[PDB]
Amino acid sequence: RLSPAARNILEKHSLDASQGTATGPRGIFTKEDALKLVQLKQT
Amino acid sequence: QPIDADVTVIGSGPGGYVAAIKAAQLGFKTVCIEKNETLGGTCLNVGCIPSKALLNNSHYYHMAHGTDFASRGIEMSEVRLNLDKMMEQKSTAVKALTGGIAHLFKQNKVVHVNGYGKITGKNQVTATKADGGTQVIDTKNILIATGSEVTPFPGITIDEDTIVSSTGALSLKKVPEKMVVIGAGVIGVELGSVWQRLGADVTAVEFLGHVGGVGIDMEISKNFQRILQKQGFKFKLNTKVTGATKKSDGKIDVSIEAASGGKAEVITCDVLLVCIGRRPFTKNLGLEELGIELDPRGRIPVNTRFQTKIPNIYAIGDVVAGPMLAHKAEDEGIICVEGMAGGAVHIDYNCVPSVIYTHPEVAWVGKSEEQLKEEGIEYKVGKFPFAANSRAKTNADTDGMVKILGQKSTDRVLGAHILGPGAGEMVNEAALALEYGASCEDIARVCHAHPTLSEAFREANLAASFGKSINF
Amino acid sequence: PIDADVTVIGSGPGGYVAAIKAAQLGFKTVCIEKNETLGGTCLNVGCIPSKALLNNSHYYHMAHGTDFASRGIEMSEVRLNLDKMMEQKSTAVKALTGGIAHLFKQNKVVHVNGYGKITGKNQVTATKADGGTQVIDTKNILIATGSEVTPFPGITIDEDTIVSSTGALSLKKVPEKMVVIGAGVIGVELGSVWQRLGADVTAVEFLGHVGGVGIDMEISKNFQRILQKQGFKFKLNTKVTGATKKSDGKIDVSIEAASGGKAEVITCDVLLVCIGRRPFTKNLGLEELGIELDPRGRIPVNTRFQTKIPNIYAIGDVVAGPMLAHKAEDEGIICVEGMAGGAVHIDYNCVPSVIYTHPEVAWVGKSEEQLKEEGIEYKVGKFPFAANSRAKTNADTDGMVKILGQKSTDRVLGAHILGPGAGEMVNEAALALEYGASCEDIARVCHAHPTLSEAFREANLAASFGKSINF
Ligand SMILES: Cc1cc2nc3c(=O)[nH]c(=O)nc-3n(C[C@H](O)[C@H](O)[C@H](O)COP(=O)(O)OP(=O)(O)OC[C@H]3O[C@@H](n4cnc5c(N)ncnc54)[C@H](O)[C@@H]3O)c2cc1C
Numbered sequence: 014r015l016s017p018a019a020r021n022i023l024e025k026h027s028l029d030a031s032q033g034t035a036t037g038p039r040g041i042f043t044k045e046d047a048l049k050l051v052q053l054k055q056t
Numbered sequence: 057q058p059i060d061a062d063v064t065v066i067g068s069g070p071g072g073y074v075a076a077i078k079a080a081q082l083g084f085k086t087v088c089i090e091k092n093e094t095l096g097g098t099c100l101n102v103g104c105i106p107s108k109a110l111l112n113n114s115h116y117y118h119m120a121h122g123t124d125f126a127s128r129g130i131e132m133s134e135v136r137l138n139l140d141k142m143m144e145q146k147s148t149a150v151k152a153l154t155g156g157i158a159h160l161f162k163q164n165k166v167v168h169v170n171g172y173g174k175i176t177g178k179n180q181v182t183a184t185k186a187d188g189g190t191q192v193i194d195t196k197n198i199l200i201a202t203g204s205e206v207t208p209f210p211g212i213t214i215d216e217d218t219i220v221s222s223t224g225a226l227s228l229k230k231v232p233e234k235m236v237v238i239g240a241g242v243i244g245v246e247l248g249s250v251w252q253r254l255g256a257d258v259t260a261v262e263f264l265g266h267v268g269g270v271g272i273d274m275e276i277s278k279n280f281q282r283i284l285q286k287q288g289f290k291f292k293l294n295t296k297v298t299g300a301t302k303k304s305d306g307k308i309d310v311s312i313e314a315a316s317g318g319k320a321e322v323i324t325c326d327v328l329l330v331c332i333g334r335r336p337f338t339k340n341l342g343l344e345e346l347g348i349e350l351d352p353r354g355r356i357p358v359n360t361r362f363q364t365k366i367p368n369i370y371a372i373g374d375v376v377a378g379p380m381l382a383h384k385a386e387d388e389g390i391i392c393v394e395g396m397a398g399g400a401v402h403i404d405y406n407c408v409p410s411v412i413y414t415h416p417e418v419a420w421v422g423k424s425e426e427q428l429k430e431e432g433i434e435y436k437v438g439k440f441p442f443a444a445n446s447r448a449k450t451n452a453d454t455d456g457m458v459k460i461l462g463q464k465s466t467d468r469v470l471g472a473h474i475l476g477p478g479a480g481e482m483v484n485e486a487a488l489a490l491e492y493g494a495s496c497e498d499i500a501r502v503c504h505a506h507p508t509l510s511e512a513f514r515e516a517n518l519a520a521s522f523g524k525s526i527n528f
Numbered sequence: 529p530i531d532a533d534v535t536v537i538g539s540g541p542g543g544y545v546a547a548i549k550a551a552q553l554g555f556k557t558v559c560i561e562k563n564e565t566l567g568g569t570c571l572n573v574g575c576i577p578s579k580a581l582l583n584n585s586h587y588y589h590m591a592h593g594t595d596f597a598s599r600g601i602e603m604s605e606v607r608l609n610l611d612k613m614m615e616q617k618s619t620a621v622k623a624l625t626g627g628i629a630h631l632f633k634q635n636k637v638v639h640v641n642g643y644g645k646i647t648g649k650n651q652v653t654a655t656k657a658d659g660g661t662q663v664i665d666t667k668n669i670l671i672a673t674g675s676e677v678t679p680f681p682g683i684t685i686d687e688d689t690i691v692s693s694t695g696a697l698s699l700k701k702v703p704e705k706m707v708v709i710g711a712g713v714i715g716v717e718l719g720s721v722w723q724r725l726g727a728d729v730t731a732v733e734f735l736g737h738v739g740g741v742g743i744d745m746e747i748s749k750n751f752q753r754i755l756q757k758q759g760f761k762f763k764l765n766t767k768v769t770g771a772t773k774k775s776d777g778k779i780d781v782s783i784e785a786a787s788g789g790k791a792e793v794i795t796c797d798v799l800l801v802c803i804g805r806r807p808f809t810k811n812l813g814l815e816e817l818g819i820e821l822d823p824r825g826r827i828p829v830n831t832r833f834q835t836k837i838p839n840i841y842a843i844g845d846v847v848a849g850p851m852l853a854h855k856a857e858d859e860g861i862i863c864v865e866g867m868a869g870g871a872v873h874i875d876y877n878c879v880p881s882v883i884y885t886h887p888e889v890a891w892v893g894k895s896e897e898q899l900k901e902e903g904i905e906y907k908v909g910k911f912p913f914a915a916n917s918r919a920k921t922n923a924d925t926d927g928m929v930k931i932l933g934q935k936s937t938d939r940v941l942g943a944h945i946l947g948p949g950a951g952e953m954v955n956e957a958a959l960a961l962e963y964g965a966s967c968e969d970i971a972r973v974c975h976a977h978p979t980l981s982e983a984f985r986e987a988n989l990a991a992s993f994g995k996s997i998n999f
Pocket residue numbers: 066067068069070071072089090091092095096097098099100102103104105107171172173174201202203204205222223243337339340341372373374375380381382383384385411413977978
């Protein structure tokens with residue numbers, strides 16, 4: 014379950030949330046998770 | 057004396073003005089062209105705004121003139137209607153909001169060009185003023201947001217005097233004794249209710265068998281209709297109009313029949329409101345000489361980035377497919393411009409809410425039971441009547457309910473339908489939940505302020521999830 | 529003499545909700561109430577009756593004042609039939625009390641009428657008026673005895689000229705002048721009600737802001753400013769030294785600066801005393817069971833709402849936490865669930881607060897002050913209702929939405945709304961916080977146009993992206 018914006022961020026950088034891990038309330042892939050992948054990739 | 061820019065937007069309505077502003081805020085040298093005297097388009101000048109204002113004022117007039125205020129100890133001499141003053145409040149709000157967009161343009165340095173826009177080259181648009189004045193704009197991108205117009209009814213000529221479109225209906229000069237409305241969709245029901253409250257004998261005639269337009273949940277539509285009829289608003293569903301005639305005394309004879317033929321009858325009225333629908337406006341935009349062909353409905357085909365065939369020319373809002381709603385046009389205008397700057401562009405239309413601003417209000421988002429059944433999706437139903445909600449009962453405004461549709465096994469919220477007090481605002485909590493792929497459980501968990509109408513939404517979700525609510 | 533699995537003492541928001549969920553989870557349940565009706569404070573002399581008067585007085589003001597005239601709704605004269613207005617309120621209360629009743633019948637939750645006293649770790653005894661008594665043996669005991677009005681030292685409330693919120697809600701006539709002691713939520717709502725109905729009202733508050741605890745300061749000051757414009761007067765940073773009944777039935781209230789000096793006297797016809805409320809645990813048997821209340825008179829509980837005796841739980845107004853009806857209900861639910869073997873959480877930073885005046889005020893999460901105090905770095909997003917389409921079309925533009933988000937994670941820390949629709953709008957915020965939403969998340973949620981909620985969307989946007997579209 015991607016959070017809106019997390020979904021927006023992942024699309025903008027062509028990333029698949031599977032690559033990361035959801036760190037948000039009740040199994041949500043938050044805007045922080047999305048950014049941790051854009052970072053922990055373009056790192 | 058040409059001028060240039062990165063993005064030129066044709067149309068200053070919900071989609072257009074919001075796109076122009078966002079474009080500028082993204083750095084794009086932006087221009088917005090508008091042929092009418094004011095910005096804001098349909099919604100602002102003859103749509104959402106004026107209609108919500110008259111809906112608000114007529115609702116209050118009804119509360120004071122009827123038994124509501126008396127039931128609360130507010131006793132009055134004689135409640136009189138000053139229609140012109142009621143029209144003035146509406147006009148003042150509209151004028152303030154139009155002035156606001158002009159100011160928001162200057163603030164974000166969006167260049168406002170007055171005139172009729174016409175694409176005269178893949179990277180050029182020519183605005184022509186009424187006086188003949190011309191202005192050329194060479195642009196990298198062109199954004200089409202020309203919106204919509206009233207769909208005429210074959211054989212009946214709207215003149216905005218006794219035969220009106222929604223525009224003429226928003227400005228009548230006196231309460232008509234009797235009014236007939238062709239079409240019981242959102243716009244028709246709203247305007248019909250406005251005049252019914254003010255004293256008109258109102259009847260809406262509709263081809264289909266339900267009111268509220270496309271997508272409305274059937275149970276919701278039927279309950280809504282029952283309430284409106286109890287208010288005095290009449291309906292002739294599964295009925296076709298075969299023609300209308302102006303009479304010797306200024307009245308109008310509208311001839312009708314059952315949709316399937318037969319049961320012919322005539323109903324006479326002082327004002328005939330025609331609102332069977334609205335359609336994409338693209339008149340002399342120059343789309344032909346550019347090879348941009350419309351679909352059968354007259355819309356401009358576009359991809360997920362809102363690009364037309366010619367990749368540097370986009371289209372959004374009422375002029376393209378999807379719900380013809382203001383917020384829909386705004387979202388598209390926003391993601392389109394963000395898209396021009398490399399941003400994502402995926403927009404889930406299943407999360408666009410619909411609202412009918414009558415009283416009771418109706419609002420919904422997601423899918424109706426009919427759609428779930430059509431897609432063969434197995435589901436659970438959660439219902440909670442406002443008559444069981446504290447704030448609603450305290451306010452003595454208890455019509456309707458909140459109906460939640462959940463995926464039979466994943467308890468995921470599939471649809472939220474609201475008929476009653478505050479439906480309009482409440483549907484946004486619903487929208488946000490869908491955008492998060494919420495489950496009935498998720499919502500049921502959230503602590504909602506007591507007493508609030510939203511508790512009906514929370515509890516309907518609990519009844520779906522757990523199978524029982526607390527207060528019902 | 530009967531028995532059950534769970535016995536709840538008190539049928540208010542926390543009590544009756546807890547009782548119903550219990551039977552709904554298979555627990556044989558009994559609920560005991562001393563009053564003639566169920567519902568507790570909120571339903572009988574609290575939330576409900578006050579919202580009814582706020583609603584009615586607001587409509588009275590729109591019709592009696594300039595609002596309706598500006599809309600073409602003309603009336604030669606508009607007058608108040610207070611009895612009738614009071615009747616609408618009580619008709620509402622009575623309907624809702626019968627409702628709780630019916631809900632107990634429906635969920636087979638047994639109702640015992642009497643003052644309940646915990647006579648043993650697994651026994652509760654209730655005593656009626658006539659003198660009779662009912663013995664209740666239970667494995668579990670849930671105490672949701674709630675609260676009572678906090679009295680003011682030196683001034684005795686008689687519910688005549690000197691009333692508490694209970695008396696203020698049933699006044700028999702509009703007082704020519706009224707003094708309110710305490711400018712918190714309850715005081716501001718009740719004083720606004722009477723100010724609209726025609727009373728010359730003044731609230732005296734020891735603290736320097738109206739609204740109670742936790743309310744954002746900027747929100748509190750804008751709110752105050754609007755109420756004063758309405759004619760509601762305030763005496764902040766002021767102490768009430770005493771009050772005296774006068775020859776003509778009026779009341780002289782003597783006041784002076786909080787820090788000292790500038791003594792004055794204000795005469796009124798009715799004195800509303802509402803400096804606070806406190807947990808009610810009188811003659812419950814706790815002093816014998818070894819249950820030691822904390823200083824403020826509250827029952828100390830743990831995460832599972834357990835007391836000293838693990839089979840005895842306390843929820844709602846009797847325990848710490850915001851003394852709100854929904855807070856009481858949430859606790860009563862998670863407690864019962866935990867009892868049936870379930871986890872129990874409740875982030876009190878997600879329990880909203882609403883002020884039902886007009887403009888309304890509502891918020892959830894943290895205020896600017898709490899953030900500064902906590903050392904949390906943040907950013908601010910504000911959107912005035914004056915720029916919100918629906919607000920403007922309705923010609924009801926007071927206020928704004930203010931969003932607070934972390935300077936770096938863009939996470940939503942708190943939301944404060946002052947203006948139309950705040951009360952319902954805060955619940956969209958509560959949902960957003962429960963998902964750890966960021967400002968961008970909300971800004972990217974499609975909101976219907978035109979709705980007041982667009983103000984919330986645009987505020988989250990100005991905070992997330994730096995600027996909104998319409999302002
Ligand atoms: C009576 C009524 C009530 C409504 N109520 C609601 C409601 O409550 N909620 C809701 O969501 N929707 C409502 N709608 C629909 C809503 O108004 C439209 O969905 C919305 O305006 C679509 O926005 P748009 O920007 O695409 O187009 P529009 O706002 O229709 O038009 C944008 C602008 O394009 C301009 N334009 C067109 N061609 C040219 C050209 N060649 N050169 C220059 N300018 C041009 C037009 O003059 C116009 O100002 C209502 C509509 C009506 C008629």
